[PDB]
Amino acid sequence: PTIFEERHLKYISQLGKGNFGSVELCRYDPLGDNTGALVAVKQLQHSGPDQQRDFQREIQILKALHSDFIVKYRGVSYGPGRQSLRLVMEYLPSGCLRDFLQRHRARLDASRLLLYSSQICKGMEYLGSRRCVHRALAARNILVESEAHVKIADFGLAKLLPLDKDYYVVREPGQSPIFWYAPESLSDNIFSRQSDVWSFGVVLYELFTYCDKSCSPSAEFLRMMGSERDVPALSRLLELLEEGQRLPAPPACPAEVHELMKLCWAPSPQDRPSFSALGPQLDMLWSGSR
Ligand SMILES: *CCC(=O)Nc1cccc(-c2c[nH]c3ncc(C(N)=O)cc23)c1
Ligand SMILES: NC(=O)Nc1ccccc1
C-alpha cells in the first residue's frame, strides 16, 4: 500500500511536535472496524517554501532507506484538499530512547547500552553509504522498537551530499541544539558524515549516562563554562572545545567506550573515525559483554 486513503487513517493522538511539523498516531483502518495497524504520520503546519521543499526531501530520503536500524517508511497520504502529503511510517510504542533510558535505567546494563550503540552505528553506516547526513542524531530522536532494538528516526534535517562533495554548508541556523554539534558546524555551518560522527559520540555519552539530567551535556557545560556566567553559551562552548575540553567520562562507562567518544570528538573532521571504523570496535565490545 503506497497511498494510504486519508478516509481510513483514524486519528488517535499527537506523538510529538517541532516548529513546522507534528507526528500523529493514527490507525490505518480500511475495514473501518478499528482493527487495522497503528502508524505514525508526519505532516507540516505553519511552514514556508523551504520547509515544504525540505519535507518532500525528508520523504524521499526515508522511503529509499531499508535498514533494520532506521524507522520504516510505509507510504504517503493526502492532507487537506489533497494539496499536500503526509508521511506514513511504522509506529514504535516504546517512544524515544532518551525517555526509555531514564525510565528503565535500573535494568539496562552496559551490555544493553553497547547493543544500542552498535545498532545506531550500523544505521549511521547505512546512511553514510547513501551519502546521507542525518544532522539531528540524539537520544531524543532515536526510537525504541523493542527492549533490544532501536531505530534512528527524525530525518527532518537530513540531507544528501552531492556526488562530488563530502560536506555541505547552510545559512546560519537561527536555533540548533548546540551541545550535539561538531565545532565546524557551530563555527562555519559545515555538515558532513564526520560531523555526524561527532554527534554520535555525544549519543554514546547520552547512552552511558542513561540521559540523567544531572550530567546532561547542558548541565556539564554549565559546570564547565567557568566563573563568568554572562558569556553566550555558543561562544563559550566553542572556546572550551578549541582548548580540548570534552564531556567527562561517565562513572559507569567502560573505558574503551570513553576512548571511542574522544576519537569521535577529534578537532579535525578527517581525524574522526568513520562509522565503518567505529562499528567493529563497538561490535567487539558488545560481543565481549553478552
Ligand atoms: C522522547 C520525546 C519525543 O520527542 N518522543 C517522540 C516524539 C515524536 C514521535 C515519537 C514517536 C513514538 N513512536 C513513534 N513511532 C514512529 C515514529 C516515526 N516513524 O517517526 C515516531 C514515533 C516520539
Ligand atoms: N563533545 C563534547 O565534549 N561536547 C561538550 C563539551 C563540553 C560541554 C558540553 C558538550
JSON list of N, CA and C in Angstrom, two decimals, residues 13-67:
[
{"chain": "A", "resi": 13, "resn": "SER", "atom": "N", "xyz": [-3.93, 10.42, 18.45]},
{"chain": "A", "resi": 13, "resn": "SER", "atom": "CA", "xyz": [-3.30, 11.41, 19.28]},
{"chain": "A", "resi": 13, "resn": "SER", "atom": "C", "xyz": [-2.10, 12.01, 18.53]},
{"chain": "A", "resi": 14, "resn": "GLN", "atom": "N", "xyz": [-1.55, 13.07, 19.12]},
{"chain": "A", "resi": 14, "resn": "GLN", "atom": "CA", "xyz": [-0.32, 13.61, 18.70]},
{"chain": "A", "resi": 14, "resn": "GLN", "atom": "C", "xyz": [0.82, 12.88, 19.42]},
{"chain": "A", "resi": 15, "resn": "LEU", "atom": "N", "xyz": [1.89, 12.56, 18.68]},
{"chain": "A", "resi": 15, "resn": "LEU", "atom": "CA", "xyz": [3.07, 11.91, 19.24]},
{"chain": "A", "resi": 15, "resn": "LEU", "atom": "C", "xyz": [4.15, 12.93, 19.61]},
{"chain": "A", "resi": 16, "resn": "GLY", "atom": "N", "xyz": [4.25, 14.00, 18.83]},
{"chain": "A", "resi": 16, "resn": "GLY", "atom": "CA", "xyz": [5.29, 14.95, 19.06]},
{"chain": "A", "resi": 16, "resn": "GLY", "atom": "C", "xyz": [5.27, 16.04, 18.03]},
{"chain": "A", "resi": 17, "resn": "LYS", "atom": "N", "xyz": [6.07, 17.07, 18.32]},
{"chain": "A", "resi": 17, "resn": "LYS", "atom": "CA", "xyz": [5.92, 18.38, 17.73]},
{"chain": "A", "resi": 17, "resn": "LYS", "atom": "C", "xyz": [7.29, 19.03, 17.57]},
{"chain": "A", "resi": 18, "resn": "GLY", "atom": "N", "xyz": [7.55, 19.54, 16.36]},
{"chain": "A", "resi": 18, "resn": "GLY", "atom": "CA", "xyz": [8.53, 20.58, 16.12]},
{"chain": "A", "resi": 18, "resn": "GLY", "atom": "C", "xyz": [7.84, 21.87, 15.72]},
{"chain": "A", "resi": 19, "resn": "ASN", "atom": "N", "xyz": [8.64, 22.89, 15.38]},
{"chain": "A", "resi": 19, "resn": "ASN", "atom": "CA", "xyz": [8.13, 24.21, 15.00]},
{"chain": "A", "resi": 19, "resn": "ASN", "atom": "C", "xyz": [7.13, 24.07, 13.84]},
{"chain": "A", "resi": 20, "resn": "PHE", "atom": "N", "xyz": [7.57, 23.37, 12.78]},
{"chain": "A", "resi": 20, "resn": "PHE", "atom": "CA", "xyz": [6.90, 23.35, 11.48]},
{"chain": "A", "resi": 20, "resn": "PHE", "atom": "C", "xyz": [6.13, 22.04, 11.26]},
{"chain": "A", "resi": 21, "resn": "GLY", "atom": "N", "xyz": [6.35, 21.04, 12.13]},
{"chain": "A", "resi": 21, "resn": "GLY", "atom": "CA", "xyz": [5.88, 19.66, 11.89]},
{"chain": "A", "resi": 21, "resn": "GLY", "atom": "C", "xyz": [5.36, 18.99, 13.16]},
{"chain": "A", "resi": 22, "resn": "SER", "atom": "N", "xyz": [4.38, 18.09, 12.98]},
{"chain": "A", "resi": 22, "resn": "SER", "atom": "CA", "xyz": [3.92, 17.20, 14.01]},
{"chain": "A", "resi": 22, "resn": "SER", "atom": "C", "xyz": [3.93, 15.77, 13.48]},
{"chain": "A", "resi": 23, "resn": "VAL", "atom": "N", "xyz": [4.02, 14.83, 14.42]},
{"chain": "A", "resi": 23, "resn": "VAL", "atom": "CA", "xyz": [3.78, 13.45, 14.19]},
{"chain": "A", "resi": 23, "resn": "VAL", "atom": "C", "xyz": [2.51, 13.06, 14.96]},
{"chain": "A", "resi": 24, "resn": "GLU", "atom": "N", "xyz": [1.61, 12.32, 14.30]},
{"chain": "A", "resi": 24, "resn": "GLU", "atom": "CA", "xyz": [0.31, 11.90, 14.87]},
{"chain": "A", "resi": 24, "resn": "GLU", "atom": "C", "xyz": [0.29, 10.37, 14.86]},
{"chain": "A", "resi": 25, "resn": "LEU", "atom": "N", "xyz": [-0.30, 9.80, 15.92]},
{"chain": "A", "resi": 25, "resn": "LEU", "atom": "CA", "xyz": [-0.60, 8.42, 15.98]},
{"chain": "A", "resi": 25, "resn": "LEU", "atom": "C", "xyz": [-1.97, 8.23, 15.35]},
{"chain": "A", "resi": 26, "resn": "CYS", "atom": "N", "xyz": [-2.03, 7.36, 14.36]},
{"chain": "A", "resi": 26, "resn": "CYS", "atom": "CA", "xyz": [-3.22, 7.04, 13.64]},
{"chain": "A", "resi": 26, "resn": "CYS", "atom": "C", "xyz": [-3.32, 5.52, 13.52]},
{"chain": "A", "resi": 27, "resn": "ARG", "atom": "N", "xyz": [-4.53, 5.02, 13.37]},
{"chain": "A", "resi": 27, "resn": "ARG", "atom": "CA", "xyz": [-4.75, 3.63, 12.93]},
{"chain": "A", "resi": 27, "resn": "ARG", "atom": "C", "xyz": [-5.12, 3.65, 11.45]},
{"chain": "A", "resi": 28, "resn": "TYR", "atom": "N", "xyz": [-4.47, 2.80, 10.64]},
{"chain": "A", "resi": 28, "resn": "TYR", "atom": "CA", "xyz": [-4.90, 2.64, 9.29]},
{"chain": "A", "resi": 28, "resn": "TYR", "atom": "C", "xyz": [-5.91, 1.49, 9.28]},
{"chain": "A", "resi": 29, "resn": "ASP", "atom": "N", "xyz": [-7.15, 1.85, 9.00]},
{"chain": "A", "resi": 29, "resn": "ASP", "atom": "CA", "xyz": [-8.28, 1.04, 9.34]},
{"chain": "A", "resi": 29, "resn": "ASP", "atom": "C", "xyz": [-9.20, 0.96, 8.13]},
{"chain": "A", "resi": 30, "resn": "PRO", "atom": "N", "xyz": [-8.75, 0.36, 7.00]},
{"chain": "A", "resi": 30, "resn": "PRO", "atom": "CA", "xyz": [-9.54, 0.33, 5.78]},
{"chain": "A", "resi": 30, "resn": "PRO", "atom": "C", "xyz": [-10.80, -0.56, 5.86]},
{"chain": "A", "resi": 31, "resn": "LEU", "atom": "N", "xyz": [-10.82, -1.52, 6.79]},
{"chain": "A", "resi": 31, "resn": "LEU", "atom": "CA", "xyz": [-12.06, -2.28, 7.05]},
{"chain": "A", "resi": 31, "resn": "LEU", "atom": "C", "xyz": [-13.08, -1.41, 7.80]},
{"chain": "A", "resi": 32, "resn": "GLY", "atom": "N", "xyz": [-12.62, -0.35, 8.46]},
{"chain": "A", "resi": 32, "resn": "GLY", "atom": "CA", "xyz": [-13.47, 0.64, 9.13]},
{"chain": "A", "resi": 32, "resn": "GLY", "atom": "C", "xyz": [-13.99, 0.16, 10.48]},
{"chain": "A", "resi": 33, "resn": "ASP", "atom": "N", "xyz": [-13.36, -0.88, 11.04]},
{"chain": "A", "resi": 33, "resn": "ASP", "atom": "CA", "xyz": [-13.86, -1.62, 12.21]},
{"chain": "A", "resi": 33, "resn": "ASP", "atom": "C", "xyz": [-12.93, -1.44, 13.43]},
{"chain": "A", "resi": 34, "resn": "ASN", "atom": "N", "xyz": [-11.91, -0.58, 13.28]},
{"chain": "A", "resi": 34, "resn": "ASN", "atom": "CA", "xyz": [-10.91, -0.22, 14.34]},
{"chain": "A", "resi": 34, "resn": "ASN", "atom": "C", "xyz": [-9.99, -1.41, 14.70]},
{"chain": "A", "resi": 35, "resn": "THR", "atom": "N", "xyz": [-9.67, -2.27, 13.72]},
{"chain": "A", "resi": 35, "resn": "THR", "atom": "CA", "xyz": [-8.75, -3.44, 13.92]},
{"chain": "A", "resi": 35, "resn": "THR", "atom": "C", "xyz": [-7.38, -3.24, 13.22]},
{"chain": "A", "resi": 36, "resn": "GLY", "atom": "N", "xyz": [-7.27, -2.25, 12.33]},
{"chain": "A", "resi": 36, "resn": "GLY", "atom": "CA", "xyz": [-6.06, -2.06, 11.49]},
{"chain": "A", "resi": 36, "resn": "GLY", "atom": "C", "xyz": [-4.82, -1.65, 12.29]},
{"chain": "A", "resi": 37, "resn": "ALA", "atom": "N", "xyz": [-3.69, -1.52, 11.57]},
{"chain": "A", "resi": 37, "resn": "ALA", "atom": "CA", "xyz": [-2.37, -1.26, 12.16]},
{"chain": "A", "resi": 37, "resn": "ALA", "atom": "C", "xyz": [-2.24, 0.22, 12.55]},
{"chain": "A", "resi": 38, "resn": "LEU", "atom": "N", "xyz": [-1.57, 0.45, 13.67]},
{"chain": "A", "resi": 38, "resn": "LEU", "atom": "CA", "xyz": [-1.16, 1.79, 14.07]},
{"chain": "A", "resi": 38, "resn": "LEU", "atom": "C", "xyz": [-0.02, 2.28, 13.16]},
{"chain": "A", "resi": 39, "resn": "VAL", "atom": "N", "xyz": [-0.03, 3.57, 12.86]},
{"chain": "A", "resi": 39, "resn": "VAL", "atom": "CA", "xyz": [1.05, 4.19, 12.09]},
{"chain": "A", "resi": 39, "resn": "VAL", "atom": "C", "xyz": [1.37, 5.54, 12.73]},
{"chain": "A", "resi": 40, "resn": "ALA", "atom": "N", "xyz": [2.61, 5.98, 12.54]},
{"chain": "A", "resi": 40, "resn": "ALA", "atom": "CA", "xyz": [3.00, 7.32, 12.81]},
{"chain": "A", "resi": 40, "resn": "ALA", "atom": "C", "xyz": [2.92, 8.12, 11.50]},
{"chain": "A", "resi": 41, "resn": "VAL", "atom": "N", "xyz": [2.32, 9.29, 11.57]},
{"chain": "A", "resi": 41, "resn": "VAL", "atom": "CA", "xyz": [2.09, 10.09, 10.40]},
{"chain": "A", "resi": 41, "resn": "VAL", "atom": "C", "xyz": [2.59, 11.50, 10.67]},
{"chain": "A", "resi": 42, "resn": "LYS", "atom": "N", "xyz": [3.51, 11.97, 9.83]},
{"chain": "A", "resi": 42, "resn": "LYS", "atom": "CA", "xyz": [4.07, 13.28, 9.93]},
{"chain": "A", "resi": 42, "resn": "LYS", "atom": "C", "xyz": [3.50, 14.18, 8.82]},
{"chain": "A", "resi": 43, "resn": "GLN", "atom": "N", "xyz": [3.24, 15.44, 9.18]},
{"chain": "A", "resi": 43, "resn": "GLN", "atom": "CA", "xyz": [2.73, 16.46, 8.29]},
{"chain": "A", "resi": 43, "resn": "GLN", "atom": "C", "xyz": [3.28, 17.80, 8.77]},
{"chain": "A", "resi": 44, "resn": "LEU", "atom": "N", "xyz": [3.38, 18.77, 7.87]},
{"chain": "A", "resi": 44, "resn": "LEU", "atom": "CA", "xyz": [3.73, 20.15, 8.23]},
{"chain": "A", "resi": 44, "resn": "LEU", "atom": "C", "xyz": [2.50, 20.94, 8.71]},
{"chain": "A", "resi": 45, "resn": "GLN", "atom": "N", "xyz": [2.75, 21.93, 9.58]},
{"chain": "A", "resi": 45, "resn": "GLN", "atom": "CA", "xyz": [1.86, 23.08, 9.80]},
{"chain": "A", "resi": 45, "resn": "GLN", "atom": "C", "xyz": [2.74, 24.32, 10.04]},
{"chain": "A", "resi": 46, "resn": "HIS", "atom": "N", "xyz": [2.34, 25.44, 9.42]},
{"chain": "A", "resi": 46, "resn": "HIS", "atom": "CA", "xyz": [2.87, 26.81, 9.72]},
{"chain": "A", "resi": 46, "resn": "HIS", "atom": "C", "xyz": [4.31, 26.95, 9.20]},
{"chain": "A", "resi": 47, "resn": "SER", "atom": "N", "xyz": [4.47, 26.54, 7.94]},
{"chain": "A", "resi": 47, "resn": "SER", "atom": "CA", "xyz": [5.76, 26.34, 7.22]},
{"chain": "A", "resi": 47, "resn": "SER", "atom": "C", "xyz": [5.82, 27.22, 5.95]},
{"chain": "A", "resi": 48, "resn": "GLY", "atom": "N", "xyz": [7.03, 27.65, 5.58]},
{"chain": "A", "resi": 48, "resn": "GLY", "atom": "CA", "xyz": [7.31, 28.45, 4.38]},
{"chain": "A", "resi": 48, "resn": "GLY", "atom": "C", "xyz": [7.64, 27.59, 3.17]},
{"chain": "A", "resi": 49, "resn": "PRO", "atom": "N", "xyz": [8.23, 28.17, 2.09]},
{"chain": "A", "resi": 49, "resn": "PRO", "atom": "CA", "xyz": [8.54, 27.40, 0.88]},
{"chain": "A", "resi": 49, "resn": "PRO", "atom": "C", "xyz": [9.66, 26.37, 1.15]},
{"chain": "A", "resi": 50, "resn": "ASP", "atom": "N", "xyz": [10.65, 26.77, 1.94]},
{"chain": "A", "resi": 50, "resn": "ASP", "atom": "CA", "xyz": [11.85, 26.00, 2.24]},
{"chain": "A", "resi": 50, "resn": "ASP", "atom": "C", "xyz": [11.47, 24.77, 3.08]},
{"chain": "A", "resi": 51, "resn": "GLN", "atom": "N", "xyz": [10.53, 24.95, 4.01]},
{"chain": "A", "resi": 51, "resn": "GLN", "atom": "CA", "xyz": [10.06, 23.87, 4.91]},
{"chain": "A", "resi": 51, "resn": "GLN", "atom": "C", "xyz": [9.31, 22.79, 4.11]},
{"chain": "A", "resi": 52, "resn": "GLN", "atom": "N", "xyz": [8.56, 23.21, 3.08]},
{"chain": "A", "resi": 52, "resn": "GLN", "atom": "CA", "xyz": [7.80, 22.27, 2.22]},
{"chain": "A", "resi": 52, "resn": "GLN", "atom": "C", "xyz": [8.76, 21.48, 1.33]},
{"chain": "A", "resi": 53, "resn": "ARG", "atom": "N", "xyz": [9.74, 22.19, 0.76]},
{"chain": "A", "resi": 53, "resn": "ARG", "atom": "CA", "xyz": [10.77, 21.61, -0.05]},
{"chain": "A", "resi": 53, "resn": "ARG", "atom": "C", "xyz": [11.55, 20.58, 0.78]},
{"chain": "A", "resi": 54, "resn": "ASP", "atom": "N", "xyz": [11.88, 20.98, 2.01]},
{"chain": "A", "resi": 54, "resn": "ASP", "atom": "CA", "xyz": [12.63, 20.14, 2.94]},
{"chain": "A", "resi": 54, "resn": "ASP", "atom": "C", "xyz": [11.83, 18.90, 3.32]},
{"chain": "A", "resi": 55, "resn": "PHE", "atom": "N", "xyz": [10.49, 18.97, 3.31]},
{"chain": "A", "resi": 55, "resn": "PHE", "atom": "CA", "xyz": [9.66, 17.83, 3.69]},
{"chain": "A", "resi": 55, "resn": "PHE", "atom": "C", "xyz": [9.59, 16.79, 2.56]},
{"chain": "A", "resi": 56, "resn": "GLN", "atom": "N", "xyz": [9.45, 17.25, 1.32]},
{"chain": "A", "resi": 56, "resn": "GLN", "atom": "CA", "xyz": [9.47, 16.31, 0.16]},
{"chain": "A", "resi": 56, "resn": "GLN", "atom": "C", "xyz": [10.82, 15.58, 0.12]},
{"chain": "A", "resi": 57, "resn": "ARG", "atom": "N", "xyz": [11.89, 16.27, 0.51]},
{"chain": "A", "resi": 57, "resn": "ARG", "atom": "CA", "xyz": [13.20, 15.68, 0.63]},
{"chain": "A", "resi": 57, "resn": "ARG", "atom": "C", "xyz": [13.25, 14.62, 1.74]},
{"chain": "A", "resi": 58, "resn": "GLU", "atom": "N", "xyz": [12.70, 14.98, 2.90]},
{"chain": "A", "resi": 58, "resn": "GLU", "atom": "CA", "xyz": [12.63, 14.07, 4.01]},
{"chain": "A", "resi": 58, "resn": "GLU", "atom": "C", "xyz": [11.95, 12.76, 3.57]},
{"chain": "A", "resi": 59, "resn": "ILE", "atom": "N", "xyz": [10.84, 12.90, 2.86]},
{"chain": "A", "resi": 59, "resn": "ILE", "atom": "CA", "xyz": [10.05, 11.77, 2.41]},
{"chain": "A", "resi": 59, "resn": "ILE", "atom": "C", "xyz": [10.89, 10.87, 1.51]},
{"chain": "A", "resi": 60, "resn": "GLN", "atom": "N", "xyz": [11.54, 11.49, 0.53]},
{"chain": "A", "resi": 60, "resn": "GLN", "atom": "CA", "xyz": [12.27, 10.76, -0.50]},
{"chain": "A", "resi": 60, "resn": "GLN", "atom": "C", "xyz": [13.42, 10.00, 0.18]},
{"chain": "A", "resi": 61, "resn": "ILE", "atom": "N", "xyz": [14.08, 10.64, 1.14]},
{"chain": "A", "resi": 61, "resn": "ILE", "atom": "CA", "xyz": [15.18, 10.00, 1.85]},
{"chain": "A", "resi": 61, "resn": "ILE", "atom": "C", "xyz": [14.68, 8.78, 2.62]},
{"chain": "A", "resi": 62, "resn": "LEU", "atom": "N", "xyz": [13.62, 8.94, 3.43]},
{"chain": "A", "resi": 62, "resn": "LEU", "atom": "CA", "xyz": [13.21, 7.85, 4.27]},
{"chain": "A", "resi": 62, "resn": "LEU", "atom": "C", "xyz": [12.73, 6.68, 3.41]},
{"chain": "A", "resi": 63, "resn": "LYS", "atom": "N", "xyz": [11.99, 6.99, 2.35]},
{"chain": "A", "resi": 63, "resn": "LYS", "atom": "CA", "xyz": [11.40, 6.00, 1.51]},
{"chain": "A", "resi": 63, "resn": "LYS", "atom": "C", "xyz": [12.48, 5.10, 0.90]},
{"chain": "A", "resi": 64, "resn": "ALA", "atom": "N", "xyz": [13.68, 5.66, 0.65]},
{"chain": "A", "resi": 64, "resn": "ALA", "atom": "CA", "xyz": [14.75, 4.92, -0.02]},
{"chain": "A", "resi": 64, "resn": "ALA", "atom": "C", "xyz": [15.57, 4.05, 0.94]},
{"chain": "A", "resi": 65, "resn": "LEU", "atom": "N", "xyz": [15.42, 4.21, 2.26]},
{"chain": "A", "resi": 65, "resn": "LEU", "atom": "CA", "xyz": [16.29, 3.54, 3.17]},
{"chain": "A", "resi": 65, "resn": "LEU", "atom": "C", "xyz": [15.62, 2.25, 3.62]},
{"chain": "A", "resi": 66, "resn": "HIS", "atom": "N", "xyz": [16.40, 1.16, 3.65]},
{"chain": "A", "resi": 66, "resn": "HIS", "atom": "CA", "xyz": [15.88, -0.11, 4.12]},
{"chain": "A", "resi": 66, "resn": "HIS", "atom": "C", "xyz": [16.89, -0.73, 5.06]},
{"chain": "A", "resi": 67, "resn": "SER", "atom": "N", "xyz": [16.82, -0.31, 6.31]},
{"chain": "A", "resi": 67, "resn": "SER", "atom": "CA", "xyz": [17.72, -0.77, 7.35]},
{"chain": "A", "resi": 67, "resn": "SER", "atom": "C", "xyz": [16.87, -1.23, 8.53]}
]
